[PDB]
């Protein structure tokens, strides 16, 4: 009839390598009306349906999860159906040939969602690096399970890489991970460093500056309610050298 | 092996509606990766897919054509090898629930185009009228076939119905052709007449005035040549009755 099983990010995330074979596997969009069929090639497409995939996927292995109703905030799954604040997963999409074009959240709903539900700051990013060729044969070059914080960086002018356009910022941006060359600028090396960086970045942007003087002992407060331990949060100025070029 | 026949857009029509029976046919776009398959609900995707779909069709017929490499000008398919100048065929599509949301042509390209190229007022026009229902199935509600002149009218302000933006002219829009509801602006009911707007559109816009004053006759010089038989286009103020409210 239906035995369904409760899985953690990291048990879809091996599963998917080893029993799938999703690195060896093929795949395509197609079209039917009528007795014709077609394959599809629109290369956009690829990144917005690998999410709805794996939701077929979850759901055909009868794993039990919640679907998230907003789009704008992690997370895109809960695999815990009792505890929505753990086992939360995140979905993520980009054509491998270039760099990740996907965006991790706008940095105003970011920042204050993180002080309200710091378990955000836990949520794992299942990310899928895609190809599709000119006969329009899908690929999954790579598949990485992240943290928010392995994924982010800091960048030229903020504590953290951003989407900033003529003065006003917008949404926080992934930096390059998985590259082998040592630039000077790397991803965060834990939890604590990338807090540090939104705590600056919430004071260097004038839109979220009103509450950036409380921002430091609410989130350490906050983190303590829902972990029953305390986070040491450094301040940017201290660390900063470690993510910037000077 | 390969026996490929020469049809028409009319035989084109006609086949789809009678031999594949497109009005009760059933579709959808799925997405195969590894052993999962899903059904894929972008509704935008669909209006772009129709004209590959046919591409498809008509190759799996071993019916002869062309493709167009200018994807801002008619046609989609030149159905004469050998006569690209006849036997032309634009496939369009929108969402039946809504009115039609495709264009017809750059006015200012279209213009210049029918005084070198007259024979593209005689392309025909496969319009698929689709839908999309909640579970993703695809399926064809209407199907025409039309000339141009049978798909566009007059508007208020212009003598032919355009996309205008802050008195700056655009795309050439169509109308709603099929509707049983009589108003006062009812499509060209001529090839004369939707010219007589052209031309006079051309004048009326800006952009376009600098070669308004010899329009016509460059025109029906340019008929005369490729169909070897003179047309008489209309003045404008004389017919504009017709196409207008008051
Ligand atoms: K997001
Ligand atoms: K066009
Ligand atoms: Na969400
Ligand atoms: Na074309």
Redesign the pocket.
Known sequence: GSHMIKLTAQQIFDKLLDEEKILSANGQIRFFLGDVDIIVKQKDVVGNIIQEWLGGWLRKREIEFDVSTN????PDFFLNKKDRSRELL?VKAFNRNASPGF???DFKMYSDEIIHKPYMLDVDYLIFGYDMDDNGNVTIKDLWLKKVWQITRSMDGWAINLQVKKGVVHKIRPGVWYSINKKNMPMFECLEDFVSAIEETVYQNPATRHNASLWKRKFEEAYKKHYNRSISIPRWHEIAHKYKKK
């Open positions: 789009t704008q905030m992690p995140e965006d991790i959240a």
